[PDB]
Symmetry: D2
Subunit: 267 residues, 4 copies
Amino acid sequence: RSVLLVVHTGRDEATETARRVEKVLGDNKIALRVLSCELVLVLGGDGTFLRAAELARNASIPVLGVNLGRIGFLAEAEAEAIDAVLEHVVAQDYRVEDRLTLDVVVRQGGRIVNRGWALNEVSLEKGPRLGVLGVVVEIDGRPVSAFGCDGVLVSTPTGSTAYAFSAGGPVLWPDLEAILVVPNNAHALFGRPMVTSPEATIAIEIEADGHDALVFCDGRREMLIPAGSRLEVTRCVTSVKWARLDSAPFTDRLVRKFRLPVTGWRG
Amino acid sequence: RSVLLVVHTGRDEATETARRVEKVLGDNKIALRVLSADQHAADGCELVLVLGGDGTFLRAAELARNASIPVLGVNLGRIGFLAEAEAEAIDAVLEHVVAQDYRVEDRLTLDVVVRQGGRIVNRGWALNEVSLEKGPRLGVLGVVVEIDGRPVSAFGCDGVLVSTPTGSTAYAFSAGGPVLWPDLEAILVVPNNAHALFGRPMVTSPEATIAIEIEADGHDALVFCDGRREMLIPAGSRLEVTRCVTSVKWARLDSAPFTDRLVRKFRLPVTGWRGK
Amino acid sequence: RSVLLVVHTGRDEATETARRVEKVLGDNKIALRVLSADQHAADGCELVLVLGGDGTFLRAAELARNASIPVLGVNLGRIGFLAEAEAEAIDAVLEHVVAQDYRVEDRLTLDVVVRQGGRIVNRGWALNEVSLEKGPRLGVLGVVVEIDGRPVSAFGCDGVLVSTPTGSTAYAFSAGGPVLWPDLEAILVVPNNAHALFGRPMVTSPEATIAIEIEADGHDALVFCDGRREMLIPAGSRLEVTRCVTSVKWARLDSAPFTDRLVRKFRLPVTGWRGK
Amino acid sequence: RSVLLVVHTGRDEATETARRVEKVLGDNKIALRVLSCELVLVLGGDGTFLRAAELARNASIPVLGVNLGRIGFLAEAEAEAIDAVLEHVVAQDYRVEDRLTLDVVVRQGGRIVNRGWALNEVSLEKGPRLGVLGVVVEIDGRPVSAFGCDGVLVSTPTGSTAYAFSAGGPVLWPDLEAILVVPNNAHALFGRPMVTSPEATIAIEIEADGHDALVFCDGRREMLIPAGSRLEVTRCVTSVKWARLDSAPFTDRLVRKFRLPVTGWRG
């Protein structure tokens, strides 16, 4: 019976909240490892949660986030509610659900030369700051557009409020199963985002006489994409497991995060 | 058996394609009714066959769903998204109609209710979009958009579109929507010229409920479903859009995938594709 | 003195601010006419003074330009862009009205002509926008937009806006326009829900001519100027928008710069500014 | 009596068009220098023209472009028309006009630590590929928005069809005098482009505890922007001089470049 606890910076292991967790779980005959098992419990922002998710997937166990700083979308609770939260952690009475996760393959000469995964996005980007990356995007084995661009995002419904949003994308609800493709600064008439069923294959071909390009998954894991490769992104067989509490529904997290005007609501 | 044939106009009943349909099916002793884009007109038919553009197709789909039978469309002039073939392959199409051996799938449809003082005062459906639009040409309609029981934004606007994946290519696109594959089951919301910082398209699971509140103080507003069925929305009322339990039955042929339809309609640049 | 006062509604003639204006100017033996938002109503006046929102202001500016005199606006409830002060500083404002010592600048105005078969059949002007809008609620209006004698795009749409820098904050913004500083002299074109890959806003020099052609085969269309002056646009006709040689005379006070007006109206996040 | 001739790559000095120029001008007692005076004549695309413009400004003399490859916006003619073009070059009968050019100042501690200029754009961009650049944009001595972003473009009406276009900007006619500001992937509700009179000052403040950022002018000249600096962009006193021929007006160059649908035009 153990748990992994993840927290933001190095000094962050001693704060009130961390301390409270370490005390309460010890006292209940649960061992506890501290970084930065049956669960990964994490204290911090969305960026820190992504990390924790990264370790929860290796082990194939649920993640559960508790927010510390400025609010985000991924936490199931805030630091004020830690007692209530730890009560569900010791009891193990929380719902667990699979969340759509992306698989990415880098293919050169028909051969898989690398791979990755993302719960948030796969971000394909220009290598050298001079110029544009030429790309062909393909959706279900058929080409949709070729253009030069800063890149292309392939995002989950969960990643839709992040980099994908900045790049011009729509907002997708997190219980949706779909894949979202957002051209990042496409030099073209048509550079609109596209949304596909979760069964589809998105492939992106990188110009063969251009420079190497890069891909960042969940803003943290980096693969080099060689000139002339094909990136294939599909829904991964294996999902990340999310601990779910009785928390604010996404609409409220959206309104809160962007300070959305909601006055006049009757209901 | 019988087949209901839908054509665009009365003087389209005499087109070469339309003439072929009448000959072929007549030769196979399949009774044909013809009509120009009768709520019960396809009662007894095994299929609604349509020749024409996407707008004609939408009329045929209504009649097909009234009867609970498949709709199949062949396009004529204007290139579109919903037809399974072009006029030149009418013989091949007629072969599949006579043998009755095409696939039939469900296509998602939207339920729309108008609610005043807690009760349902009108109801409609859509395969393409529900478009809530301002009454007067003058001002702005104040709305609150509410997603799953919870308010997401309030703003003045020309209106709000609630669209299927199929409708995303239509009026939703014009208003700034993303392109959705007709393969997907989701609901798309597109604020129409919202005077607001946040007027972004939103996409929801197909089990979602989208509600829009119309300002109590202002003018009545209008709803257009699939560009033709109109309801009046009283000020202070509220529109509720969900997935309808009754889908349209969509005949399928071995036809071009949606990706090809998109590239063709918009002339999308595609050179250098398989190159890697 | 004389001054013409414009208020929003008849039962706004009795507001505390409106009452103050009548007292102050009456005490200085300045004749006051009052009216609610008379094409010649400000004939003889040295100023049109307005109390209310941006819409009320636009009515006053019309009357001021009819008389060739300055307009000055004070806002009441709703925060806007065109007033030079808020209600709470009415005494300070009245001081500048009595001494007649405010600056007056030219604000750019648009000339709009409706042309059929090579001749002018109607004419209008605008300080905010010209909005060409589809007649029927149903379909799409086909247009060709032509910039300086040359076609730039043809598409179906709900309409096309031709806006001043001042109007860019208004209906043009809702339709997806960029924000222009009222300092600039330019013309902005914003396609309204264009069903097209390219429906981007375009910005032109103030010496440009923007013409829009309305499809010959389709329905008549409508033009709204500054949200109130309506003309009917016959199918096959053509709208020509240029800068009018007659500007509006814009009284200025020591007021907030446009940047502050924008931040305030849209609640724009601004924290950490001078930090470098 | 001399002219500078600029051409794309190294092998490019021997092509039919270059050769024709070198012959015709020699024969007319005009000396000619060849790279990559009364005029800078340039053969190539928009990218090569930008370079030539860079050398025409040092000398304070007109540039005149003749297009070789795929069409752009800056050339006054194409390679088929070189004889006609050279006839105006020998005669010196062409119109010359000043085009709006941007001045940029990098200011740290109230002190000018660098500077640049642009006929196309000033592109302020994220330094390290991880994360976002925090920025405050100010327009006439007053703050308009703070956000994180990939960057901010400050563009001329001429640069509006380029990187600024890819980033979501409107199209501006080249005889307009204005300045265009386009937030590049702003994580904010308001990230719309803004257009100012040519008299205005655009300033951009970079977060003081972030990373250093970069600026690229006309896609070629690079300055490092230190954390906590202020970029100031104004209209430069000194303009680039453009040789003007009897060429396609910009509307036609737009339609041609993006293959814009124009059928049905009556006129």
